[PDB]
Design a protein around this nucleic acid. Structure first.
Lengths: 138, 122, 117, 59, 205
RNA sequence: GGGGAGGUUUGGCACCUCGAUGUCGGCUCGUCGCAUCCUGGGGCUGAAGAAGGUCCCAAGGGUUGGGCUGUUCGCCCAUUAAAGCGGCACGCGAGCUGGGUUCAGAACGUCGUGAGACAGUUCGGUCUCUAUCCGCCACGGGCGCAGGAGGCUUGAGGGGGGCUCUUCCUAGUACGAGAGGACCGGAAGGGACGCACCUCUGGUUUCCCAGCUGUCCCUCCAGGGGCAUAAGCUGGGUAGCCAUGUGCGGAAGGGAUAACCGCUGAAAGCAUCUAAGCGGGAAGCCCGCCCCAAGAUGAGGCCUCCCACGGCGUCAAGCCGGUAAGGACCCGGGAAGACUACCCGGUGGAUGGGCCGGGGGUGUAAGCGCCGCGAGGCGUUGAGCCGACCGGUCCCAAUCGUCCGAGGUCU
RNA sequence: ACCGGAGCGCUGUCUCGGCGAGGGACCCGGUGAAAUUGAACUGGCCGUGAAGAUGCGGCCUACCCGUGGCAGGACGAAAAGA
RNA sequence: GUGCAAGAGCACUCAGGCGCGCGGGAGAACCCUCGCCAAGGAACUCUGCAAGUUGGCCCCGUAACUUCGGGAGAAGGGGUGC
RNA sequence: GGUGAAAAGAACCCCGGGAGGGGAGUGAAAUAGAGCCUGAAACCGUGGGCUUACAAGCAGUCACGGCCCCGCAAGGGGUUGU
């Protein structure tokens, strides 16, 4: 009866980790979806990002993307609908974890305060064919 | 969040670019509006060369909220403003060219002719 | 459904942290100080946790010490003496307790803070 | 001076009834373990004190 | 007819089907059957259910340890459920199978002093325009000379908070036997460890 | 042409009120009356179905904003199930508004020769913190409860509850010229709403962090400190608290009944729902449904605990102290809270502070090297900093103990 | 720093209110008033009167008394009606 | 004194002075003064009334009409630290 | 406007920081004790004798009762439940 936490935490039948590692830089590829009358569609979601509410389980986060006309916002939760979801252009570098002043002035001013963390790419590529050495032994 | 003064915009080709919501054509004392309600908006501005003119009362289909509407599938979605199109006094929009994406919000309203024209869906 | 997270109040944020730090300075000067109860209560809380912070011995949290209070000389006294004592003492380094009669000039409760190693 | 001004004069009855609701209530004291003194509850008596023994200057 | 005791754990918006649903988990917990009640010898339809055991020293007294089956006394008492009568066994969770709505009585967070604007719902006054005297207040009350009385049962300012109330119709989603967690819809007042119980709902016909 | 009803409008009476009754309309808070706007219903039709005209019953609920309306009668658009009519001093300025009419200024008018006159006009222009009782909202202290006590009670009164609209399957069928278009039952939702939750939605968070400045400080640099608010300024914000977010509900069913639809049925060889009796019949009445609830002075019902005289009152009723079972104190505290009350734990111990660890917020700290003429930047370093939610943990704080506490009236 | 209309962009004026700061307002120890005041042991009510009843008749309930208050009654209070 | 264009205006601050002659807690409805807000942006209402935006310095610029000084520092906008 | 006839105006000692009291002496008198002849009522207090917590009030009066204390008797005080 004690640790009410551990109660609420063991309740987590959801432990979905079929996704890479991310940080407030970028993200890009795929989400999921339904659209057509009864599922059937794979509407991926590329682009950037915005906010991350990490309640552990209520890990839901809104994305910035920009659809032709203007821009779009969307909150997704980590644990089910977002099929493969897998990003690609992760990148990093942000002096904060709440990017909002972008919805203010947005175009090249973005790409200015937008930098990149090669670091992540480095360890990703290291882990790439160090897994060829994992296709060797251990 | 719309009311009988909420200045709102359009993303169509037809004529008007800005109007002002009058009512919601629903539960008449509701007034609050998200992606689905029906504003009988009064036209405010249009293009000086074409049909449909400034200041004619028009009925109107609603999209794009600025405080994300709570999605059934867990999520939450909104656009970059508060806007949509007109409905005419014999059902459907007097329009023909959408600018930018929509949501399946509209799809859940069952108005497909709009959605087939819709380039991106959310 | 009010004060739904607890605290002892009076004064204001500024004068709160002020007289906090004050009574805490004069505290760690004479080591043992006469006061009223509420003062003494959340004083012993704040000072308890604070003394945990003082227990260590790193530049970082030391600047942090004088980042809070004032004179660094008591920080001398603290590191070279208080740390080796409370080296084997964790989680309760202040004994502040009540007293009779009360502030016999306005009828306010009494208490006193002690060293306690 | 303004509005709610005593309609009439109150009775001594209701006066000292309003007064009656406040009978002066006594304090609380228990003895000190190893002495003769009625210290207030939980509190250490001015002299004597608690276990371990300290202060002791309330002649 | 049916029912079970419970404590509020959680509230999250789990993804059943593909959906965000408010899920309150209720640790019904070990609720042993003890004093059974009948009209003739007592008064009404009831049985007694002890939420969860944790009182040897700090309770004393008859103990329903005498009752017939010991079972000691819970951390907090056994209670007489309106409409309920089992066999002779400990009720916990599996008596409620996946896919049913139930009534749910809560004891909930008190507040104390409560104002009208969040008790009833009035219009406060001008944050500018007229008097800044009134700011937040209900305004008038009753009529002039006739009738003249502030009516009995009137809506006024005072207390609103800890109330004993049964809520109507909420689907039971799932059930856990090993630790004892019933999983249902999303509401339940009280603290995140406050007091709440299940009854059998009064559905359609 | 008759007579009546009701006292919302404009008048008659001047009878309380000129030993200060302060005003339309607007905001606020309602409550009622039904001669009823809408939803129920039923009969009638000069009622094909769809719709309408009329009368009667039927309040449980509902009845929008807006521009010119200051505004008495507005008007119109946009709605809506309809956008009810009225009593309540034209309900309600010791609740508010104050555009208003009735003050001194001042310009228009007008009438009189003029001081002045108006229910002719116009701009601005100073509504006196305090609750003595009843009334209402919750919070308590007294005593009852005819042995004393720790728990579980029934349900009577009383209260909340009672809204509507959209599309489809019937069925484009019956009906019918086609258009059109069904009763009934049913089936998915939104609005007005009541209830509750943080889970999501997005909100405050007063020191939880991070970048900036004028000044002054430590200590000269780095670094840090108040001052600029009663936080100097901004960026963000979990738990808590919060609505727009989020879940839940009105009904359903029974009983009698109205307006009304019918049976058997005579008085009177005919009739007749009525005279004897029966059926059906409303969102309405009561319950059913949710809240209060044993000062329901009826204090009721139930599990159990304890137990003579232990001492006078020789009869009558008590009295008197240690006790029983237990309790009251004080603390540590609290999702309890104005106090109270309510709840837990009390060295027997995880009750609070601290340690600690998880979550969580801030989002690579100071300090060393490296590089740059340098402000800064790079490795260190998603790191330093750490208020609530989850607890593992006795170091500090709940020591110690204080006082109170049945003797079971009576037939 | 005068008055009428209109838009521009900013707004808690309002939709519609929630959270936060002090000084309070709440319990304590010290010190403590006022205008007024025949009385009081002061209820709902349909009646009843110089026409507008806590008190008279009737009817009904509500055990005795007090804080924190909303301000409908006490035909208001204050200056013996503008 | 510093820094702010200048000054004595502003903030911080030198000497000087004061902690303003009752204190203390819990941390209500409500009140004074102030802070925030999703999304709407005068629907509030007697009217933008108050609050609210707007503020200094360098330039791009400034119409009708004029009695030539005006309107102008118009309006609308760009730039501001090391 | 007031001690007494005159100050003989309270020495010595006890509680207190004193202020005030407590024993004394004094004088006929010390509620003649220093603002001291009388010292009503309003108004504010102590014990105790009697009542009042099922109750609707110009609080008084009439019949009765219960209680406490005067009365030898009968009586009577007064308390005030119906």
């Amino acid at each position: 009866m004690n640790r009410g936490a551990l109660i609420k935490l063991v309740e987590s039948r959801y432990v979905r980790t079929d996704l890479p590692e991310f940080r407030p830089g970028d993200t890009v590829r795929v989400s999921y979806k339904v659209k057509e009358g009864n599922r059937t569609r794979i509407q991926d979601f590329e682009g950037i990002v915005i906010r991350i509410r990490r309640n552990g389980f209520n890990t839901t986060f809104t994305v910035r993307k920009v659809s032709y006309g203007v821009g779009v916002e969307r909150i997704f939760p980590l644990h089910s609908p977002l099929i493969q979801k897998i990003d690609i252009v992760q990148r990093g570098r942000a002096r904060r974890a709440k990017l909002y002043f972008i919805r203010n002035l947005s175009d090249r001013e973005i790409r200015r305060k937008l930098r990149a963390d090669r670091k992540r790419i480095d360890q990703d590529r290291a882990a790439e064919r160090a897994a060829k050495e994992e296709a060797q032994k251990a | 969040m719309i009311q009988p003064q909420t200045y709102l915009e359009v993303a169509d080709n037809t004529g008007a670019r800005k109007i002002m919501c009058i009512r919601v054509l629903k539960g008449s004392n509701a007034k609050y509006a998200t992606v689905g309600d029906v504003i009988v908006a009064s036209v405010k501005e249009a293009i000086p060369r074409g049909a449909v003119k400034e200041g004619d009362v028009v009925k109107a289909v609603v999209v794009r909220t600025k405080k994300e509407i709570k999605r059934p599938d867990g999520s939450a979605i909104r656009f970059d403003d508060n806007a949509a199109v007109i409905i005419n006094n014999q059902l459907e929009p007097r329009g023909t060219r959408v600018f930018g994406p929509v949501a399946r919000e509209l799809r859940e309203k069952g108005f497909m002719k709009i959605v087939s024209l819709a380039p991106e869906v959310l | 459904r009010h004060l739904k997270s607890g605290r002892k109040l009076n004064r204001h944020s500024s004068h709160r942290l002020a007289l906090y730090r004050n009574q805490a300075k004069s505290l760690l000067t004479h080591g043992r100080i006469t006061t009223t109860v509420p003062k003494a209560k959340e004083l012993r809380g704040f000072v308890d946790h604070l003394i945990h912070l003082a227990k260590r011995g790193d530049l970082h949290a030391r600047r942090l010490v004088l980042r809070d209070l004032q004179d660094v000389k008591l920080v001398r006294k603290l590191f070279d003496e208080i740390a080796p004592r409370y080296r084997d003492r964790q989680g309760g380094y202040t004994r502040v307790l009540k007293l009779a009669e009360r502030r016999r000039g306005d009828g306010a409760p009494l208490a006193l803070v002690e060293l306690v190693e | 001076a303004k509005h709610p001004v005593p309609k009439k004069k109150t009775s001594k009855a209701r006066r000292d009834a309003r007064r009656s609701h406040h009978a002066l209530t006594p304090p609380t004291l228990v003895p000190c373990p190893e002495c003769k003194a009625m210290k207030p509850p939980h509190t250490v008596c001015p002299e004597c004190g608690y276990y371990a023994g300290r202060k002791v200057l309330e002649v | 007819m049916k029912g079970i005791l419970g404590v509020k754990v959680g509230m999250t918006r789990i993804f059943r089907d593909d959906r965000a649903v408010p899920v309150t988990v209720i640790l019904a917990g070990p609720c042993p059957v003890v004093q059974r009640r009948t009209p003739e010898k007592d008064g009404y339809t009831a049985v007694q259910l002890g939420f969860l055991p944790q009182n040897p020293k700090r309770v004393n007294r008859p103990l329903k340890g005498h009752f017939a089956k010991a079972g000691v006394e819970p951390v907090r008492i056994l209670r007489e459920i309106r409409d309920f009568n089992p066999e002779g066994d400990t009720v916990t969770v599996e008596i409620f199978k996946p896919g049913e709505r139930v009534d749910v009585t809560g004891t909930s967070k008190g507040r104390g002093f409560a104002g009208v604007m969040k008790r009833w719902n009035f219009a406060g006054g001008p944050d500018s325009h007229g008097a800044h005297k009134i700011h937040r207040h209900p305004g008038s009350i009753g009529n002039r000379k006739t009738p003249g009385r502030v009516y009995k049962g009137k809506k006024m300012a005072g207390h609103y908070g800890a109330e004993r109330v049964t809520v109507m119709n909420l689907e039971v989603v799932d059930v856990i036997p090993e630790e004892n967690l019933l999983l249902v819809k999303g509401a339940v007042p009280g603290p995140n460890g406050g007091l709440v119980i299940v009854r059998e709902t009064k559905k359609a016909a």
